Ligand binder design. Structure first.
Ligand SMILES: NC(=[NH2+])NCCC[C@H](N)C(=O)O
Length: 325
């Protein structure tokens, strides 16, 4: 029962946007970023979005983007249509893209990717684990959160439960981001495996990548610019298909450091910064933090901030594998 027409690998364009959506049903439980990101991906100068087509119909997608000053290729968004899964399509698409990178980007030495699924033996054999972070996913209505937070945080103050610790501002334009991330000691003691993870995307801490990060509208927060120990990072919210009513946004916060109290205070700062912009909308807030801090922050979010836990503990894995020219 051979397929009548063969597989054709071609670079994605804006015309296939609706075809790509048709194969993306239920991806990441409705937290899929590609609906909101597909068009920007096409404008990225170091990125190649590859579609697998059978008889002219899109059935799979993979993106490869060269970062880390040309030494790394990040693999994102790998997906196959539900009705084409289990036939090795994702494997064939992976091989086409690996050859493309080796051909166009001879300087790439490693491939990198992030994932939340359990790392089976296969993974451990083909990939090195650079680092891993815990994942805390909560949901809330922005308006309801704002209307009740003052009372919530006042109770904590008087209750003696919690009082927000001081935090310090971080300005990219002012040069604070560079002075933090280019610090060898911050890279060693703060960053997970010496790596910046921003909305599932890993970057080596380098000026070249800092330029990429600066163009995304990220917001930073730190415990002390002089004595940095906890550094948090918020990605600008964007729409996700969850809910089907178009009201849901994905708020990604990456937390680097081992002081749980500072991760709490800095998470609260980001929430008070971002929720006003989300009035009238619903938010899926995913916090990535050191695994040992998870229970502390899940409680804080649940009991302290009246937030709803969407799912139990899971982990984000940063994987790396060499490129075999
Ligand atoms: N909820 C998740 N599992 N998100 C995974 C995002 C990262 C994934 N490797 C991608 O580029 O699509």
């Amino acid at each position: 029962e051979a397929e009548a027409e063969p597989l054709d690998f071609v670079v994605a364009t804006e015309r296939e946007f609706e075809e790509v959506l048709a194969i993306s049903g239920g991806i990441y439980g409705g937290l899929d970023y590609l609906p909101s990101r597909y068009h920007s991906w096409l404008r990225d100068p170091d990125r190649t979005v590859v579609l697998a087509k059978r008889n002219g119909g899109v059935i799979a997608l993979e993106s490869v983007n060269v970062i880390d000053a040309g030494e790394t290729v990040l693999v994102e968004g790998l997906r196959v249509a539900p009705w084409e899964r289990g036939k090795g399509v994702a494997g064939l698409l992976q091989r086409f893209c690996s050859q493309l990178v080796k051909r166009q980007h001879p300087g790439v030495k490693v491939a990198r990717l992030t994932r939340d699924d359990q790392l089976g033996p296969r993974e451990l054999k083909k990939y090195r684990l650079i680092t891993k972070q815990g994942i805390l996913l909560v949901r809330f209505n922005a308006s309801a959160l704002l209307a009740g937070l003052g009372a919530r945080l006042a109770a904590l103050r008087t209750s003696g439960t919690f009082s927000p610790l001081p935090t310090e501002a971080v300005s990219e334009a002012g040069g604070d981001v560079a002075r933090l991330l280019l610090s060898p000691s911050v890279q060693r003691d703060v960053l997970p495996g010496g790596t910046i993870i921003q909305d599932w995307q890993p970057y080596r801490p380098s000026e070249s990548n800092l330029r990429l990060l600066a163009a995304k509208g990220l917001e930073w927060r730190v415990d002390s610019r002089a004595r940095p120990r906890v550094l948090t990072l918020c990605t600008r919210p964007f729409p996700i298909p969850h809910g089907g009513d178009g009201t849901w946004r994905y708020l990604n916060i990456d937390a680097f450091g081992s002081d749980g109290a500072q991760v709490q205070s800095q998470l609260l700062w980001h929430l008070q910064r971002q929720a006003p912009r989300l009035v009238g909308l619903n938010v899926m807030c995913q916090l990535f933090l050191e695994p040992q801090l998870w229970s502390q922050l899940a409680d804080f979010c649940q009991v302290g901030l009246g937030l709803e836990l969407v799912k139990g503990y899971t982990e984000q894995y940063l994987l790396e594998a060499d490129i075999h020219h």
